[PDB]
Amino acid sequence: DDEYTKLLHDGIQPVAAIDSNFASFTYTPRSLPEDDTSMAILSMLQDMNFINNYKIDCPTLARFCLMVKKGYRDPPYHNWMHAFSVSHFCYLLYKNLELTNYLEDIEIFALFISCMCHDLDHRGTNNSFQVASKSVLAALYSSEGSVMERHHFAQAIAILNTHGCNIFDHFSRKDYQRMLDLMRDIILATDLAHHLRIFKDLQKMAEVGYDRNNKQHHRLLLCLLMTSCDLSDQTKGWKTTRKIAELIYKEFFSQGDLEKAMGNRPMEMMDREKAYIPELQISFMEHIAMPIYKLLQDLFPKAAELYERVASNREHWTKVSHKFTIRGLPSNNSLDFLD
Numbered sequence: 001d002d003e004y005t006k007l008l009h010d011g012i013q014p015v016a017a018i019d020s021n022f023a024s025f026t027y028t029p030r031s032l033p034e035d036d037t038s039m040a041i042l043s044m045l046q047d048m049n050f051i052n053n054y055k056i057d058c059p060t061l062a063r064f065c066l067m068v069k070k071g072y073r074d075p076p077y078h079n080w081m082h083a084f085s086v087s088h089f090c091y092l093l094y095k096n097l098e099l100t101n102y103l104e105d106i107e108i109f110a111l112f113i114s115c116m117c118h119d120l121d122h123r124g125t126n127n128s129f130q131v132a133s134k135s136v137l138a139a140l141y142s143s144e145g146s147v148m149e150r151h152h153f154a155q156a157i158a159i160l161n162t163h164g165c166n167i168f169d170h171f172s173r174k175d176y177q178r179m180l181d182l183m184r185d186i187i188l189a190t191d192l193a194h195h196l197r198i199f200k201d202l203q204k205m206a207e208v209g210y211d212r213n214n215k216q217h218h219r220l221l222l223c224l225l226m227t228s229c230d231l232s233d234q235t236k237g238w239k240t241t242r243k244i245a246e247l248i249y250k251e252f253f254s255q256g257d258l259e260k261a262m263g264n265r266p267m268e269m270m271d272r273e274k275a276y277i278p279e280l281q282i283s284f285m286e287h288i289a290m291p292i293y294k295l296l297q298d299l300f301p302k303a304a305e306l307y308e309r310v311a312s313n314r315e316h317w318t319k320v321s322h323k324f325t326i327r328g329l330p331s332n333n334s335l336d337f338l339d
């Protein structure tokens with residue numbers, strides 16, 4: 001490809017040159033034209049010193065980036081831009097939060113790689129639709145749970161074992177297999193069921209306080225950080241939140257259409273005739289998003305602004321609620337829609 005040419009010959013742009021605001025929480029990675037994002041991945045890893053630290057071969061890494069990028073389909077939400085903006089938020093965590101005092105470098109490295117790979121080959125439909133619609137993935141995976149996530153992992157593994165893409169094949173067998181373990185745990189942790197299982201443990205962790213010598217704290221923190229990244233679109237301003245809803249509901253309603261055409265009734269939120277958006281968004285923000293970011297703040301006080309921004313985005317939903325009632329006449333002055 002021609003993308004492959006340019007990445008392999010031009011050089012790794014330093015990070016400041018992408019945007020003077022690039023390492024800030026107020027930065028919106030979705031502003032970056034899709035065509036610059038593989039480059040940026042490279043700059044982020046460079047700026048974290050990983051390329052030098054773990055002695056990664058540059059061409060192999062370039063090839064791996066591109067494979068990961070094209071292993072994403074194009075549903076409205078779960079596409080390469082989602083994956084890039086989740087990896088970018090992992091980068092901010094390392095730059096802003098000083099994870100190094102809580103995590104080994106190999107763990108931080110794995111989180112970042114996992115971020116890029118965590119939704120590989122997503123089709124825009126969720127775990128219950130896979131079962132509900134008895135697909136090959138459910139066939140493969142459904143008896144162990146997390147259908148989509150096991151598929152994401154499996155695709156990551158398939159890219160790694162593609163000639164010239166194995167950015168880890170020079171690690172010791174000990175480090176190589178630690179790296180596969182960590183990616184499997186982290187990708188699996190992106191299922192909301194997983195997160196709901198470990199919630200008390202996370203609360204406990206923040207309650208007793210973080211213990212650097214407790215291996216299980218390392219594991220739990222890794223899971224919290226992955227869910228932080230995966231929800232990071234809710235940490236920017238109202239403009240991002242609104243646009244994120246458009247893309248998320250377009251995907252849910254599409255799946256809902258397909259559930260109706262197969263002869264099931266979709267859940268409310270996936271049904272475009274019943275889904276009432278402000279209320280679903282407010283529920284999501286209150287029950288899932290806010291608690292994840294409150295936990296982040298409990299363990300790294302410099303993460304407080306993330307939480308208040310999420311809270312603040314939930315407030316806007318409430319403020320615009322009323323606009324989903326047609327008062328007066330519709331713009332075209334006709335009750336045509338009513339028929």
Ligand SMILES: CCc1ccc(-c2c(-c3nn(C)c4ncnc(N5CC[C@@H](N(C)C)C5)c34)cnn2C)cc1
Pocket residue numbers: 190191192195227230231232233234244248284288
């Ligand atoms: C464990 C952390 C986690 C990870 C991914 C998701 C997620 C979303 C999502 N991501 N973001 C940024 C959203 N912003 C608003 N609403 C969203 N939906 C509305 C309904 C809600 N659902 C889970 C009941 C999610 C989402 C879409 N699919 N999945 C699986 C959710 C939680």
Ligand SMILES: [Mg+2]
Pocket residue numbers: 118119190
């Ligand atoms: Mg996912």
Ligand SMILES: [Zn+2]
Pocket residue numbers: 082086118119230
């Ligand atoms: Zn995701």
